[PDB]
């Protein structure tokens, strides 16, 4: 009560902007990149999405109601109604938001960076992408700030497609080599979209039309 109107639509975003940090800073394996808050009547159901729910379930509650005891106590939220419904997060290279987490960690445990680089590419550009984008600009064993680079594609951004192709995707390092704030942007192939547009706005396609009857001699018929 005594509730300010527009602030409740901006305070929850601040609440959105900080809950994601632990799914960065605590886990690495399962792929739980995209968080999703579903508020039903009197319950906040953020959907736990884990491919290997044994860190969370384990011995019937390893971290089901263990992670909640921080965050529900952090926001002075009531216990019990902090429902964290378990699910499986989506595929590794074969998703959209996971392409952050796909390459958040895939620089090596200690060999040459080119053989790190040329691995990551051939998977999904054929199997579910025409645009993704990672970040690399670092040195090789000298006192130079050299900048060698790569990527895979041109993206899909044609206007308002900057603001639905950019998303909640900020994932850090689980690599032995290289640490700083690493960022990934993701703009997939349009041929399998199923939500909105399907082709780039320059594209045009005319249809074939079929071969013709020769001359159509009159032969009129009376039904």
């Amino acid at each position: 009560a005594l509730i300010s109107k527009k602030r409740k639509l901006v305070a929850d975003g601040v609440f959105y902007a900080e809950l994601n940090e632990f799914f960065t800073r605590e886990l690495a394996e399962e792929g739980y990149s995209g968080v999703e808050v579903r508020v039903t009547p009197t319950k906040t159901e953020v959907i736990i999405r884990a491919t290997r729910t044994q860190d969370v379930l384990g011995e019937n509650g390893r971290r089901i109601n263990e992670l909640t005891l921080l965050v529900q106590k952090r926001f002075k939220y009531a216990p019990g109604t902090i429902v964290l419904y378990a699910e499986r997060v989506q595929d590794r290279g074969l998703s959209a938001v996971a392409q952050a987490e796909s390459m958040k960690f895939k620089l090596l445990n200690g060999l040459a960076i080119r053989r790190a680089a040329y691995g990551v590419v051939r998977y999904v550009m054929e199997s579910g992408a025409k645009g993704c984008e990672v970040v690399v600009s670092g040195k090789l064993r000298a006192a130079r700030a050299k900048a060698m680079k790569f990527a895979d594609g041109f993206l899909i951004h044609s206007g308002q497609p900057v603001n639905d192709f950019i998303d909640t995707a900020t994932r850090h390092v689980l690599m032995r080599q290289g640490v700083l704030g690493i960022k990934v942007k993701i703009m997939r192939d349009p041929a399998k979209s199923r939500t909105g547009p399907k082709a780039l706005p320059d594209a045009v396609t005319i249809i074939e039309p079929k071969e013709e009857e020769p001359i159509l001699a009159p032969s009129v018929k009376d039904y």
Binding site: S4, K6, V10, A11, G13, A17, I166, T168
Partner: protein, 37 residues
Amino acid sequence: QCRVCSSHTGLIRKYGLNICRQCFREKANDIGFNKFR
């Protein structure tokens, strides 16, 4: 408060969010602000 990125000044006191503006440009997406014009 001084939040993070070498700032206790230029805070955004408006709309009750209280963020240092150096650390707003990288957080303005997931809040749900977007530029259009």
